[PDB]
Enzyme design. Structure first.
Site, PDB file in Angstrom:
ATOM      1  N   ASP A  27      32.526  12.807  59.885  1.00 16.40           N
ATOM      2  CA  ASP A  27      33.529  11.939  59.328  1.00 16.40           C
ATOM      3  C   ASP A  27      34.613  12.922  58.965  1.00 16.40           C
ATOM      4  O   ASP A  27      34.454  13.977  58.369  1.00 16.40           O
ATOM      5  CB  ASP A  27      33.010  11.194  58.164  1.00 16.40           C
ATOM      6  CG  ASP A  27      33.355   9.785  58.116  1.00 16.40           C
ATOM      7  OD1 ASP A  27      32.535   8.752  58.157  1.00 16.40           O
ATOM      8  OD2 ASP A  27      34.422   9.394  57.879  1.00 16.40           O
TER       9      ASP A  27
ATOM     10  N   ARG B  55      28.698  -0.900  49.868  1.00 13.51           N
ATOM     11  CA  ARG B  55      27.667  -0.028  50.503  1.00 13.51           C
ATOM     12  C   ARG B  55      27.794   1.374  50.145  1.00 13.51           C
ATOM     13  O   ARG B  55      26.879   2.216  50.052  1.00 13.51           O
ATOM     14  CB  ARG B  55      27.346  -0.714  51.793  1.00 13.51           C
ATOM     15  CG  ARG B  55      26.081  -0.266  52.288  1.00 13.51           C
ATOM     16  CD  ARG B  55      25.536  -0.774  53.685  1.00 13.51           C
ATOM     17  NE  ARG B  55      24.760  -0.449  54.573  1.00 13.51           N
ATOM     18  CZ  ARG B  55      24.513   0.486  55.137  1.00 13.51           C
ATOM     19  NH1 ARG B  55      25.474   0.989  55.718  1.00 13.51           N
ATOM     20  NH2 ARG B  55      23.430   0.845  55.795  1.00 13.51           N
TER      21      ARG B  55
ATOM     22  N   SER C  37      56.715  67.492  27.534  1.00 12.25           N
ATOM     23  CA  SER C  37      57.198  67.698  28.847  1.00 12.25           C
ATOM     24  C   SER C  37      56.172  68.653  29.698  1.00 12.25           C
ATOM     25  O   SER C  37      56.120  70.027  29.296  1.00 12.25           O
ATOM     26  CB  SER C  37      58.514  68.352  29.302  1.00 12.25           C
ATOM     27  OG  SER C  37      58.802  68.427  30.254  1.00 12.25           O
ATOM     28  N   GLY C  38      55.275  68.273  30.503  1.00 13.92           N
ATOM     29  CA  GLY C  38      53.958  68.787  31.062  1.00 13.92           C
ATOM     30  C   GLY C  38      52.557  68.576  30.584  1.00 13.92           C
ATOM     31  O   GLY C  38      51.599  69.355  30.909  1.00 13.92           O
TER      32      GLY C  38
ATOM     33  N   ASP D 150      11.190  50.127  27.235  1.00  7.00           N
ATOM     34  CA  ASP D 150      11.109  50.424  28.645  1.00  7.00           C
ATOM     35  C   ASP D 150      11.164  52.112  28.719  1.00  7.00           C
ATOM     36  O   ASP D 150      11.041  52.403  27.474  1.00  7.00           O
ATOM     37  CB  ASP D 150      12.521  50.099  29.538  1.00  7.00           C
ATOM     38  CG  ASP D 150      12.364  49.927  30.823  1.00  7.00           C
ATOM     39  OD1 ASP D 150      12.405  50.940  31.719  1.00  7.00           O
ATOM     40  OD2 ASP D 150      12.433  48.782  31.378  1.00  7.00           O
TER      41      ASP D 150
ATOM     42  N   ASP E 148      59.195  68.268  40.446  1.00  3.17           N
ATOM     43  CA  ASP E 148      59.012  68.801  39.028  1.00  3.17           C
ATOM     44  C   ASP E 148      57.629  69.071  38.711  1.00  3.17           C
ATOM     45  O   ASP E 148      56.865  68.362  37.858  1.00  3.17           O
ATOM     46  CB  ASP E 148      59.641  67.714  38.303  1.00  3.17           C
ATOM     47  CG  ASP E 148      60.220  68.172  36.760  1.00  3.17           C
ATOM     48  OD1 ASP E 148      61.068  68.870  36.854  1.00  3.17           O
ATOM     49  OD2 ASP E 148      59.504  68.121  35.740  1.00  3.17           O
TER      50      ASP E 148
ATOM     51  N   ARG F  31      20.810   3.797  56.606  1.00  2.62           N
ATOM     52  CA  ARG F  31      20.582   4.329  58.035  1.00  2.62           C
ATOM     53  C   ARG F  31      19.929   5.701  58.123  1.00  2.62           C
ATOM     54  O   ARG F  31      19.033   5.895  58.942  1.00  2.62           O
ATOM     55  CB  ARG F  31      21.803   4.168  58.661  1.00  2.62           C
ATOM     56  CG  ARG F  31      22.606   2.773  58.899  1.00  2.62           C
ATOM     57  CD  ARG F  31      23.739   2.816  59.532  1.00  2.62           C
ATOM     58  NE  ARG F  31      24.866   3.635  58.935  1.00  2.62           N
ATOM     59  CZ  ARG F  31      25.411   4.839  59.668  1.00  2.62           C
ATOM     60  NH1 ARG F  31      24.780   5.154  60.881  1.00  2.62           N
ATOM     61  NH2 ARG F  31      26.406   5.370  58.864  1.00  2.62           N
TER      62      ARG F  31
ATOM     63  N   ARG G 210      22.899  44.003  39.168  1.00  2.00           N
ATOM     64  CA  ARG G 210      22.290  43.127  37.658  1.00  2.00           C
ATOM     65  C   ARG G 210      22.262  44.353  36.853  1.00  2.00           C
ATOM     66  O   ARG G 210      22.910  44.172  35.572  1.00  2.00           O
ATOM     67  CB  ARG G 210      21.077  42.213  37.945  1.00  2.00           C
ATOM     68  CG  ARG G 210      21.102  41.582  36.715  1.00  2.00           C
ATOM     69  CD  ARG G 210      19.869  40.220  36.972  1.00  2.00           C
ATOM     70  NE  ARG G 210      19.256  39.527  35.776  1.00  2.00           N
ATOM     71  CZ  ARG G 210      19.838  38.552  35.550  1.00  2.00           C
ATOM     72  NH1 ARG G 210      20.825  38.055  36.181  1.00  2.00           N
ATOM     73  NH2 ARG G 210      19.725  37.818  34.364  1.00  2.00           N
TER      74      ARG G 210
ATOM     75  N   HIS H 173      60.484  71.489  35.168  1.00  2.00           N
ATOM     76  CA  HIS H 173      61.689  71.208  34.226  1.00  2.00           C
ATOM     77  C   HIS H 173      61.595  72.509  32.931  1.00  2.00           C
ATOM     78  O   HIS H 173      63.020  72.600  32.690  1.00  2.00           O
ATOM     79  CB  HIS H 173      61.324  69.925  33.641  1.00  2.00           C
ATOM     80  CG  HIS H 173      62.475  69.338  32.910  1.00  2.00           C
ATOM     81  ND1 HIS H 173      63.440  68.559  33.218  1.00  2.00           N
ATOM     82  CD2 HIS H 173      62.944  69.590  31.518  1.00  2.00           C
ATOM     83  CE1 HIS H 173      64.451  68.199  32.676  1.00  2.00           C
ATOM     84  NE2 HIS H 173      64.245  68.864  31.478  1.00  2.00           N
TER      85      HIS H 173
END
Length: 682
Positions: free
Chosen positions: A137, A151, A632-633, A321, A537, A115, A334, A494
């Site tokens: 549908d 069909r 420490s630090g 290039d 601290d 159809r 890209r 500290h």
């Protein structure tokens, strides 16, 4: 524009194409919506040449290849293999039914007389034999079967993640700007009002766009930040999928690291002989692997070009290039030029040089990469152009035919050429040489220890210059620090808790060995002590005499105010630590620990809401270390473009290194406003 995905520097091989003159990007989009001769799916646009190309061929049928000055937009309706609700706008490549029957042609009358046909119904888009829904549908898009037994029959097609979410919502693309309570959503690009480690420029594959709901850390349902200052993030109540979930793959009963050198490498002329460890572009993006085909599908593989030596995600040049080039992890961009300077062993290179991408370059250079005579900006022969003239762009300083970059192209400065075959060509312009040793730029190349190594490895001699060894009055190391200025030293509060005397403390710079110190080591005693107003601290130290900046003593880079490091970003932590007998006793050791966002760490299995906005999280999620790494630090540095930026300060009084539990660090960026204030007044 919303239903189109941009691809910078992309060109497809087309036969059925239409070329015409266009001013702006939106002017080209009008030709796509109309569809005169053929149904448009993808279109090529030139920003400088101003010539638009309307094409029918897409990435699924044609091949994608790199090209200069080109922006490619692709239709989402034709690329989507999944249906939308009823499947009216469905334009997929389905060639099979739910049972397993071959699709019949819409135009063909044998065996079943149809159809709907392309000659009668062209508005619906009944392409060759593909499944379409022309009668509204509700079940889905139907098609005619090859066998004479039946069909027509419906097809087993997956549903889009626009109306409803699948399983957890990992590949969710639903456009909803509302939470479960009613609070408005916050933009992922902006860091205001809440600072976070989810930047769309760093994570373009994670589908992070605008302010839509996304799940990038395997959390229950698609979560997003709120505009409210009290609540940082909130979950969303999105309806669940009624259709079956997508198949993962098999149902039976590794990552490229950053080996980019801190000291800028130089390429020989074109870059075909260059064999470096670099993997960073001009903008500062992660490079795609040569062997890998995701996200950008290309031909440039090690099998095709073996002489070039295409390995990992390193910077190379196979088909020649003006400079080295490699693909990026960004699906929208890209290819981009690599952040590499020119070889040492028109205008002079010593006085005339460009800054960054060469946008603010007003030089006297007039020679191209090949050596073609440069055409004047005001002249319209042999190339005719309406845009980028000394009248249109006043904030560029377009004088005669000299090198000027107004738009900000990837290949640096650009100008027109006298040759009719070439429209525009880039020029060999040198970069601005640093007069003094900039912050976060060491002269000695680091070893770069991977995250998988338990504990860490011995660092290179004088590779870490910003490492401060806080020694006592007689001479003994106990805690570490970080150098930011020749008179200012940043560490943890500290250390100063034990003794509040300034003369008692001593500063050691450029140290590799703890026991037997190097002959060229500076020793300057602390004059003043500074503490944080909210009792945190973190502490600042003022030196009695300014330290001389040499190859061994270089300060660390300071970050922008209120900035959170991206999720799973590899960061280095230095310090001697608890040395007993392990390989490198009394020597400086380096360790790589990935930084995890506060949102992921606040869960029941890790910290359970013990970390605030001011605290940073770093460590391994699986297979950690019991022993504490560094001092420490100690400094927490991340490699960005070509410099190491200090982002965290080591503190054991908040969180220690444990297996399957990341350690708590003090974020510098949050306290950066306070640090800058002390340096300005004193």
């Amino acid at each position: 524009l919303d239903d189109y995905v941009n691809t910078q520097g992309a060109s497809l091989f087309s036969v059925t194409k239409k070329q015409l003159g266009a001013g702006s990007i939106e002017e080209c989009a009008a030709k796509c919506e109309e569809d005169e001769e053929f149904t448009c799916r993808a279109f090529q646009y030139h920003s400088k040449e101003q010539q638009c190309v309307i094409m029918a061929e897409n990435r699924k049928s044609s091949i994608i290849i790199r090209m200069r000055d080109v922006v490619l937009f692709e239709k989402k309706v034709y690329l989507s293999e999944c249906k939308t609700g009823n499947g009216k706008n469905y334009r997929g490549t389905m060639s099979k039914t739910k049972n397993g029957i071959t699709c019949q042609k819409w135009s063909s009358t044998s065996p079943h007389r149809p159809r709907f046909s392309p000659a009668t119904h062209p508005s619906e888009g009944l392409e060759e034999n593909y499944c379409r829904n022309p009668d509204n549908d509700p079940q889905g898009p139907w098609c005619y079967t090859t066998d004479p037994e039946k069909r027509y029959d419906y097809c087993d097609i997956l549903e889009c993640e626009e109306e409803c979410m699948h399983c957890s919502g990992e590949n969710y693309d639903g456009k909803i700007s509302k939470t479960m309570s009613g609070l408005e959503c916050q933009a992922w690009d902006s860091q205001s009002p809440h600072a976070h480690g989810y930047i769309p420029s760093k994570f373009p594959n994670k589908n992070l766009k605008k302010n839509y709901c996304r799940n990038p850390d395997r959390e229950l349902r698609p979560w997003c930040f709120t505009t409210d200052p009290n609540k940082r993030w909130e979950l969303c109540d999105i309806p669940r999928c009624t259709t079956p979930p997508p198949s993962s793959g098999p149902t039976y009963q590794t990552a490229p690291p950053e080996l980019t050198p801190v000291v800028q490498d130089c390429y020989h002329g074109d870059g075909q002989s260059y064999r470096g460890t670099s993997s960073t572009t001009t903008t500062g993006k992660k490079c795609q692997s040569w062997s890998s085909m995701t996200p950008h599908r290309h031909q440039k593989t090690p099998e095709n070009y073996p002489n070039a030596g295409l390995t990992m995600n390193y910077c190379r040049n196979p088909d020649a290039d003006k400079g080295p080039w490699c693909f990026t992890t960004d699906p929208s961009v890209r290819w981009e030029y690599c952040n590499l300077k020119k070889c040492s062993g028109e205008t002079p290179s010593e006085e005339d040089c460009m800054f960054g991408n060469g946008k603010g370059y007003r030089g006297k250079r007039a020679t191209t990469v090949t050596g073609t005579p440069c055409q004047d900006w005001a002249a319209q022969e042999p190339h005719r152009h309406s845009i980028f003239t000394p009248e249109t762009n006043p904030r560029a300083g377009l004088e005669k035919n000299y090198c000027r970059n107004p738009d900000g192209d990837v290949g640096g400065p650009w100008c027109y050429t006298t040759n009719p075959r070439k429209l525009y060509d880039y020029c060999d312009v040198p970069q601005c040489a640093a007069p003094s040793f900039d912050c976060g730029k060491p002269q000695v190349e680091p070893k770069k220890c991977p995250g998988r190594v338990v504990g860490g490895c011995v660092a290179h001699p004088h590779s870490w210059p910003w490492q401060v060894s806080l020694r006592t009055r007689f001479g003994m190391h106990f805690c570490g620090g970080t150098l930011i200025s020749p008179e200012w030293v940043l560490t943890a509060a500290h250390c100063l808790e034990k003794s509040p005397r300034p003369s008692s403390y001593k500063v050691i710079l450029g140290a590799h060995q703890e026991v037997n110190l190097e002959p060229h080591v500076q020793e300057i005693e602390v004059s003043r002590l500074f503490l944080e107003p909210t009792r945190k601290d973190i502490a600042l130290l003022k030196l009695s005499s300014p330290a001389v900046i040499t190859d061994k003593v270089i300060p660390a880079c300071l970050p922008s105010p209120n900035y959170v490091v991206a999720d799973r970003t590899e960061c280095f932590i230095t310090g001697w630590g608890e040395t007993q007998g392990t390989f490198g006793a009394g020597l400086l050791k380096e360790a790589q620990l990935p930084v995890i966002e506060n949102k992921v760490c606040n869960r029941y299995e890790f910290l359970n809401g013990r970390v605030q906005s001011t605290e940073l999280c770093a460590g391994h999620l699986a297979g950690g270390t019991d022993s504490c790494q560094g001092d420490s630090g100690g400094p927490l540095v991340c490699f960005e473009k070509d410099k190491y930026i200090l982002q965290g300060v080591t503190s054991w009084g908040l969180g220690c290194a444990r297996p399957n539990k990341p350690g708590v660090y003090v974020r510098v960026s949050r306290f950066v406003t306070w640090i800058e204030g002390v340096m300005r007044n004193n």
